[PDB]
Amino acid sequence: AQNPNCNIMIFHPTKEEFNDFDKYIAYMESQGAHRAGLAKIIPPKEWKARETYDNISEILIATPLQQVASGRAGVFTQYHKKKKAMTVGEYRHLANSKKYQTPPHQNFEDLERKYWKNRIYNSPIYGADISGSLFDENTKQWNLGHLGTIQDLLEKECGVVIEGVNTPYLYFGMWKTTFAWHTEDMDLYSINYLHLGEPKTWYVVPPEHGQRLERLARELFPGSSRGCGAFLRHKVALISPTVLKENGIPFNRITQEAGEFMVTFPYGYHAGFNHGFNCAEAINFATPRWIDYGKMASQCSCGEARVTFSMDAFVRILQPERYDLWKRGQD
């Protein structure tokens, strides 16, 4: 069995190996990458996403989200308070302001310490989940706007044609902006490209150990657990590495820098934070190996998790027994 300790693997494909996306994902899995839940892909040196980032300031962040925390430093939830619209230029200025900018630090490890110590005492503003793309239409390799769609994958594997579309999302981050512990909708893969700016630190639990994280989460967030049997789908709960170590949950951590891709694998729980002003692009995708995870994915039916149009068909076809109850949650 490849990669039995479930370490995060880093890949350096050649330009020739960067042509065929599906084939490279399948190569990575042949080497055990999926066992970690997360992999890093450094593109060939010849590759670029686009020529420059000099003309992005007029993108609109229609609903910036202020991430307000409650709890203790290592075990907290966050809620998202909607703020007034602002452009990317306005947001970048705010990120760089004395109130919100990254503090002086020695290295990534010192910054990580400061994050876990102090995150709860501040409420950073995240421009998340903005439909769109920063890949140039002429970038032919690993262009997240030109991937094969999940609906076409389901059709190719299972023969059923379904409605729905699959498009990327932009994330504009600042210091302390935070992604809570989650897997993807329907336990899909995700791919994330950091286009510009400061790094993003990731934590991940191997898929084979996801249920250990869930059991801890039910203990640490007992009211949330009673409210919903899949409350991590709400994407609001944070647990520090110190807390995970104290409770013996297996995990790994890695920092993504500008110009690098990360891939999350089916049922790989992940969380993390941004180091300063940045912009990432991400999209879900599927492979043949995903199908069995989609059939087994937990679902939120309490009404909180509220998701895309396109998840309807996945639940309807892969989880017909759950469909009625899940749809009640959606309506």
Ligand X SMILES: O=C(O)CNC(=O)C(=O)O
- Specify the DSSP element, H or E, that contains 263: strand 261-264
Q: What is the DSSP letter of 311?
A: H
Size of the site for Ni ion (CB under 5 A): 1
Of 171 and 221, which CB lies nearer to ligand X in the complex structure?
A: 171
**93 belongs to an annotated ligand binding site:** no
Q: Which does 58 bind (CB under 5 to 8 A by kind): ligand X, Mg ion, Zn ion, none?
A: Mg ion
**235 belongs to an annotated ligand binding site:** yes
Q: Which does 280 bind (CB under 5 to 8 A by kind): ligand X, Zn ion, Mg ion, none?
A: ligand X
DSSP letter string, 173-197: E-TT-EEEEE--GGG-EEEEEEEEE
297-326 residues in contact with Zn ion (CB under 5 A) are 300, 302, 304
Among 282, 297, 300, 318, the residue binding ligand X under the rule CB under 6 A is 282
d(CA 117, CA 71): 13
- For residue 106, the tally of other CB atoms under 10 A from its CB is 9
The single-letter code of the amino acid at 225 is S
Of 82 and 248, which CB lies nearer to ligand X in the complex structure?
A: 82
Q: Is residue 305 involved in binding ligand X (CB under 6 A)?
A: no
CB of 203 to Zn ion, least distance (A): 22
CB of 87 to Mg ion, least distance (A): 8
CB of 282 to Mg ion, least distance (A): 20
Of 72 and 306, which CB lies nearer to Zn ion in the complex structure?
A: 306
Residues 6+ apart with CB under 8 A from 28: 9, 11, 34, 39, 41, 263
Q: Which does 298 bind (CB under 5 to 8 A by kind): ligand X, Zn ion, Ni ion, none?
A: none
Which residues here bind Mg ion, judged by CB under 5 A? 56, 58
Of 77 and 323, which CB lies nearer to ligand X in the complex structure?
A: 77
CB of 179 to Ni ion, least distance (A): 7
Give me the sheet containing 237-239, strands edge to edge: 9-11, 38-41, 261-264, 189-197, 278-285, 169-173, 125-131, 65-72, 75-82, 237-239
**Distance (Å) of CA 183 to CA 16, 195, 209:** 31, 22, 13
d(CA 132, CA 130): 6
- For residue 320, the tally of other CB atoms under 10 A from its CB is 9
For 304-308, the CB contacts below 8 A with 24+ separation are 304/228, 304/231, 304/233, 304/234, 305/230, 305/233, 305/234, 305/235, 305/329, 306/330, 307/185, 308/185
* Per-residue binder mask for ligand X (CB under 6 A), 247-266, x = binder: -----------------x--
Is residue 175 a contact partner of residue 101, using CB atoms and an 8 Å limit? Answer: yes
Among 190, 298, 299, 310, the residue binding ligand X under the rule CB under 6 A is 190
Is residue 91 a contact partner of residue 175, using CB atoms and an 8 Å limit? Answer: no
Q: Is residue 166 involved in binding ligand X (CB under 6 A)?
A: no
Of 278 and 301, which CB lies nearer to ligand X in the complex structure?
A: 278
Q: Is residue 91 involved in binding ligand X (CB under 6 A)?
A: no
131-190 residues in contact with Ni ion (CB under 5 A) are 190
Q: Binding site residues, as ranges? A: 126, 182, 184, 192, 200, 228, 234-235, 270, 300, 302
The contact set with Ni ion (CB under 5 A) reads 190
The contact set with Zn ion (CB under 5 A) reads 228, 300, 302, 304
The contact set with ligand X (CB under 6 A) reads 171, 179, 190, 192, 264, 270, 280, 282
